[PDB]
Symmetry: C2
Subunit: 228 residues, 2 copies
């Protein structure tokens, strides 16, 4: 139960949330026994794990007039949230708002179910140092190392290709098209040029959209490997 | 001004590896004549300690019990003892490091033989604030990841250009003297899948954090400098 939810949250990819001009990065894991949520804004990380009793109590308090078993509530919440997180630009039906309490965060979600209002509230406390570390720092660390290894392998491939180009040029005919000529690859020169020119835009985090849009698969793979 | 300078110096400072007692940590310290700042971690928790001259003198007197020196000289000697050890490993600095994770706070004890005489210090680092740990580890790391992804994309497009040139050479009716050097066409999808299947388990491993300080410091420096320049 608890371990199941923790593992499901760990092995989930980050998703982008837009709400009242604000942006957030959210990971969600729903199950019949409860749900786990981890939200962040690149400055603070909040985590909330809720079981059957808490979800039932909160649903009764919020939806005064929605009598249903907690499992059905969890299933409906999953059906409402998962498609939105997975793909952006989805038909706008789930409105979100965030209230930043002095310590906690209140995420209010209002949606439509068969034309009827449906309210829910996530009361997220500040994430524990261990959870935030395990969810962001170590996985990001692994992705950085894996990308460094990828760059090294691609540099080796470029060295092989440059050697073979030199072999062709040493004993070969002229080029049918002269516009396809390429200069020899230098790792130091390429690194310096990239750092001087395109690092300011390449490393621009912004609001977190590029991170979720670009390299979520690597994050998922690194987290799955770390699990084992 | 002193606090802002300390924060900026700490932010610009890179990470270093400190093997102390049957364990190791990632440390980042910036010491100036008016105080110092320290950020330590073990990849699970982050502790931070910003310290000024008055408490420096107080704690130095509480610990040494026989040394009377101005706080500026004490900080200068502490920097002289620490920086060479951080910069390179296996440095015979005669510095002994111990850690005590008492309650939530962390006590990092440093002992040395200053010109053949005892010298003690203690860092009473508290749990790092959520904003500080974020700005120091999360944002720079993800900026590094994005920069490396852009580097990989650049390498892939350069591979594509080289492959186009190679196809042109082949179509030009030219034959290689030796086929032992022949290379096959490169595909981004195939290479990515092969790498993920084969080398990802070994590359993604962080262990105690040594590979990061060994290989991913210059990019960290550049990303942090860009971030501070932006705001």
């Amino acid at each position: 139960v608890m371990e199941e939810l923790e593992q499901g949250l760990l092995m989930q990819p980050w998703a982008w949330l837009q709400l009242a001009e604000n942006s957030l990065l959210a990971k969600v894991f729903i199950t019949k026994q409860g749900y786990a949520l981890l939200v962040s804004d690149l400055q603070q990380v909040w985590h909330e794990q809720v079981d059957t009793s808490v979800v039932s109590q909160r649903a009764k308090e919020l939806n005064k007039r929605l009598t249903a078993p907690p499992a059905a509530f969890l299933c409906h919440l999953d059906n409402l949230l998962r498609p939105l997180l997975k793909d952006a630009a989805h038909p706008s039906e789930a409105t979100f708002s965030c209230d930043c309490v002095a310590d906690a965060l209140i995420l209010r979600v209002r949606s439509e179910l068969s034309g009827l209002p449906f309210y829910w509230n996530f009361h997220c406390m500040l994430a524990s140092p261990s959870l935030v570390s395990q969810h962001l720092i170590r996985p990001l660390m692994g992705m950085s190392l894996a990308l460094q290894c990828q760059v090294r392998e691609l540099a080796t491939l470029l060295h092989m290709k440059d050697l073979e180009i030199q072999d062709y040029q040493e004993s070969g005919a002229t080029l049918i098209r002269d516009r396809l000529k390429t200069e020899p690859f230098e790792e130091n020169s390429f690194l310096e040029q990239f750092m001087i020119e395109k690092l300011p835009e390449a490393c621009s985090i912004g609001d977190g959209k590029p991170f979720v849009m670009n390299l979520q698969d690597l994050y998922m793979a690194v987290t799955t490997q770390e699990v084992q």
